[PDB]
Design a protein around this nucleic acid. Sequence first.
RNA 1: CGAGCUGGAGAUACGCUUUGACUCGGGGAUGUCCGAAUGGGGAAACCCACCUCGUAAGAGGUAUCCGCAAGGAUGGGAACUCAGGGAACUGAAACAUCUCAGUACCUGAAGGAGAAGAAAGAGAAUUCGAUUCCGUUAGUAGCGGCGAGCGAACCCGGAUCAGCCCAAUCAAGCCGAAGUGGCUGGAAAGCUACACCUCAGAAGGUGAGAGUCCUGUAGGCGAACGAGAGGUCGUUGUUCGUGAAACGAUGACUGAAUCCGCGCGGACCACCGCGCAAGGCUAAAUACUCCCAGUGACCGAUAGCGCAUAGUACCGUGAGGG
RNA 2: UGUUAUGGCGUGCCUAUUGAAGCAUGAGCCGGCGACUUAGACCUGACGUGCGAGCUUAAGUUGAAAAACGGAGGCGGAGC
RNA 3: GUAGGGGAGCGUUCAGUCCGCGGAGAAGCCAUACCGGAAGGAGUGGUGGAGCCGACUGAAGUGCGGAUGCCGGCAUGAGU
Lengths: 59, 134, 194, 110, 72
Amino acid sequence: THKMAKRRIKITGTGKVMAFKSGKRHQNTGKSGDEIRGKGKGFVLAKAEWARMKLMLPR
Amino acid sequence: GSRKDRKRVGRGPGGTDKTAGRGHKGQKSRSGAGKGAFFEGGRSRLIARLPKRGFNNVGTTYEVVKLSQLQDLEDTTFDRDTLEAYRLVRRKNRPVKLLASGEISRAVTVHVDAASAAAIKAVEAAGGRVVLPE
Amino acid sequence: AQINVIGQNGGRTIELPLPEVNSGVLHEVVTWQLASRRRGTASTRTRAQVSKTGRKMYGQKGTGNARHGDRSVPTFVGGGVAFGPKPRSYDYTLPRQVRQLGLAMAIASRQEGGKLVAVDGFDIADAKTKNFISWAKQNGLDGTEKVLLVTDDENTRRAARNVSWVSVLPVAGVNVYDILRHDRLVIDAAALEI
Amino acid sequence: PSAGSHHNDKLHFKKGDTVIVLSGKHKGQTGKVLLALPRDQKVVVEGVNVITKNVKPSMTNPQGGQEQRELALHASKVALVDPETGKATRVRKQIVDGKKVRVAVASGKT
Amino acid sequence: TGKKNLVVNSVIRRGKARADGGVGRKTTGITKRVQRANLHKKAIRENGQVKTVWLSANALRTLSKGPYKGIE
RNA sequence: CGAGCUGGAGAUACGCUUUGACUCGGGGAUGUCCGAAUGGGGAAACCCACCUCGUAAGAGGUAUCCGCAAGGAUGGGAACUCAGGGAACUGAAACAUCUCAGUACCUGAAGGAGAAGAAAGAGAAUUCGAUUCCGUUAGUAGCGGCGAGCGAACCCGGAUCAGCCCAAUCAAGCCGAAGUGGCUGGAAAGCUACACCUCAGAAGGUGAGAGUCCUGUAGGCGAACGAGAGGUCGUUGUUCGUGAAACGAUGACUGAAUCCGCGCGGACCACCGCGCAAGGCUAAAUACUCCCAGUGACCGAUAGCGCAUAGUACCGUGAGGG
RNA sequence: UGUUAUGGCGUGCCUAUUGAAGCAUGAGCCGGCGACUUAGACCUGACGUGCGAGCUUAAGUUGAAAAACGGAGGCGGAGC
RNA sequence: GUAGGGGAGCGUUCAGUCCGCGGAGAAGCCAUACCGGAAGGAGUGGUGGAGCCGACUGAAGUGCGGAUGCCGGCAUGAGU
Ligand SMILES: [K+]
Ligand SMILES: [K+]
Ligand SMILES: [K+]
Ligand SMILES: [Mg+2]
Ligand SMILES: [Mg+2]
Ligand SMILES: [Mg+2]
Ligand SMILES: [Mg+2]
Ligand SMILES: [Mg+2]
Ligand SMILES: [Mg+2]
Ligand SMILES: [Mg+2]
Ligand SMILES: [Mg+2]
Ligand SMILES: [Mg+2]
Ligand SMILES: [Mg+2]
Ligand SMILES: [Mg+2]
Ligand SMILES: [Mg+2]
Ligand SMILES: [Mg+2]
Ligand SMILES: [Mg+2]
Ligand SMILES: [Mg+2]
Ligand SMILES: [Mg+2]
Ligand SMILES: [Mg+2]
Ligand SMILES: [Mg+2]
Ligand SMILES: [Mg+2]
Ligand SMILES: [Mg+2]
Ligand SMILES: [Mg+2]
Ligand SMILES: [Mg+2]
Ligand SMILES: [Mg+2]
Ligand SMILES: [Mg+2]
Ligand SMILES: [Mg+2]
Ligand SMILES: [Mg+2]
Ligand SMILES: [Mg+2]
Ligand code: NA
Ligand code: NA
Ligand code: NA
Ligand code: NA
Ligand code: NA
Ligand code: NA
Ligand code: NA
Ligand code: NA
């Protein structure tokens, strides 16, 4: 599904999920401090498998 | 011969048959039958709900030419743009980039399409000249 | 290391594939070959749509002791087949390097027993056939073992028609299955050879 | 149901040629050709004698009995013989009639 | 039917919501998606002899100015 | 072609056949009645007419739509092609878009093929250069309640490759090499001892298993003579769902120029570049298969077509089933 | 081996279920028919083989009692 | 030891190859107290009247007690 192409999960060297933070960004924001500037990286060692299977080929 | 001709001893293994096993009821117990549309993708099970977009472009991809390919081995048979096809850098349709990875002193000349700063301050530093299109 | 029977004399040319012939390697080959021969043939009405039958039948509930809809289904004597034979191909392309290696290894297998070559067959002299056999009887070719001739020249083939003695092979159309099929082998011409 | 179609529906003999029985019964026994049926490959020859009985219900004085009749054969013969044995006549020629051809093997007397 | 070329044969018809707004709204939802056709008008015209056939308004305006293989 | 023939037909009688019977090819002559059915009517295979030519019998003509005439067409076709019209279940684990899908069906037209076609193009190299199809690009670019999911094109390779004309050998068929004895047997083509052919060891039949018994195959021969514009409004196509939305197309209103011209190059403008509509036709490469031949790690009759013949018996008012 | 008397012991089969000899489901008997397949140079992994820092063609052409030609292209090779 | 995963094999049809068997008689059917760890295999006899084992390898319309399964035949209810 083409959506997966612009979705944080790119193909890295090793082959794992490139994620960010889906905590709260746009709509609904105006509390806490650096919780907003927390746009780092994400990695999951339990949903990589069932995730790269819709984009592994089109790396 | 044609009768003493065996197999690779571990090439093709017998196929899996589901009929008869004195205790085989293939698939789950319930909710799995004549229905192959479950899938593992979708849009609510670990997929969507994720907050991205970015912006897709994909313009020009260059061909990495490891410095160790030019230097190290080989006897400089000139790079140019035709004789370099035989240097295991056959791609076509895209320009060629020079990058620095091998550290070794040797005077060679390089004729690619684009090159990196370090590469230029690496080839000339040991003798040679990198020529780029006008 | 096989010397030519009639004409010159060499045989030291052509390197032999290592090791000393490998069964499985010919296995992969023959299999592929016979596979490219199998023809697409499957007279079966697998589909329930392909056979002649209506779509409605008896009532779902009611009649009792039934529960069927059409009469073309696999459970019915006369209907269609469940997962039957479809007309397909099964012709792949076994990697070239491996086909080249094949017959090399085949000849190899024949260079350790029944190997035979010959330049020029002036002995043949027209069809006749008879003098061809007489010829064989002067080349260890009793007619007890199966043989394959892979030589050009029409006139020579024309004079070669039998079952147990030899076999004709136009324009060096070599084939691991063929050579390994017959016992002795008669390369004769040095076209593909050397 | 096929029958005799296996051959090109032609006979290698006529209805007045002396022929011998090759294989089967009456080996070597010869006779003349009475009936020749090309399709069913049947040939009547005064040799193979079979004592049959014609059933006559009500045909004016039935009087049942065992009459003497012939039995047909297939290509189970050898058409035309001269050296006292079978032969494979082919060689064609002519004497005074160019409109018809003849037969022979190594002899010429058919 | 008209005179020149073929006529009638018409297309479908869509219907959206939230028409306009503050420089581009949210989006356009379609709701309609039904299909219709278009008819035409005739007139009493002759060609060579006494005829009536049909005459589209377009071809009428066009014929009145120039007799393209025909006459009022 | 050279002795037989007298249809599947089992039987009987009478008969036809060297003045070449049948059979196999190839042209003619007879073809009632119905059926596009067409003299009129008609619940098809029936009923009723008139006119003309005439020895009564009988034959001929008499439908409608285009033309001076000749002539051609309304009919029928399994599938395939183009066109007019155009679903729903289903999917989105509900459902309105979107998918299903321009699928199914319907209808019109035509052929052995159609469609398409000789640039107001593709495209970004100041390039290729009719169309179609195949491979690939690539499942990329892109579309999408941005969800389900849908999905090009250019370059390149390959099948085949032409642009010219208006307005101002296959069907008959013949020829065709090479075996005898003895033995088991009801009967051998098998066993056995010798021999031969082989530009013929494909195959079928013959009392059983088959080179040399038969028909044939390799090969050779082979006829009278028969074939080969723009814009606005409503919408749509292409990947394009109103999105910045071009362009093509069309219904309704309007309505330009033509040589310091016109269109296009994803609103628009300048520059730049490609191309010149509103006229037409046009092999091959492509699809499919009723029909025929050959072939099959295709069936061998609860299979294989439904049928080792039957769309029959049988069921239904009927379509239809079988 | 067959048959039989007597003793001991002994809750059909399947399915579905927490739990079946179940008074839960199915089924008269036998015969035959009858259900995890096939496709897409697709995706991913195990095994095996040929090559190896390179590894392979597709359409097609020419030949077919046989197969070779065909490198447009795809995967390696640099990532962010 | 159920769901489930893993391993080694039996059997059937077709195919290639090899060794062959068959009128003094194949396959198939029928009997049997033998062999193998299972799937199974073999000897002998009976029937039969044409074809078919074994080994190796390849490919599947490949193994039935069930589905109120499909077809067919024959039972029970009863001499009611
Ligand atoms: K298993
Ligand atoms: K069971
Ligand atoms: K591997
Ligand atoms: Mg920031
Ligand atoms: Mg269950
Ligand atoms: Mg449950
Ligand atoms: Mg289903
Ligand atoms: Mg999906
Ligand atoms: Mg959810
Ligand atoms: Mg009941
Ligand atoms: Mg059937
Ligand atoms: Mg009439
Ligand atoms: Mg439409
Ligand atoms: Mg929308
Ligand atoms: Mg649209
Ligand atoms: Mg427009
Ligand atoms: Mg049947
Ligand atoms: Mg039956
Ligand atoms: Mg119990
Ligand atoms: Mg009870
Ligand atoms: Mg119960
Ligand atoms: Mg229940
Ligand atoms: Mg017999
Ligand atoms: Mg099955
Ligand atoms: Mg049962
Ligand atoms: Mg009951
Ligand atoms: Mg029953
Ligand atoms: Mg009583
Ligand atoms: Mg009672
Ligand atoms: Mg009573
Ligand atoms: Na990246
Ligand atoms: Na934002
Ligand atoms: Na004849
Ligand atoms: Na749905
Ligand atoms: Na139609
Ligand atoms: Na518009
Ligand atoms: Na039977
Ligand atoms: Na047994």
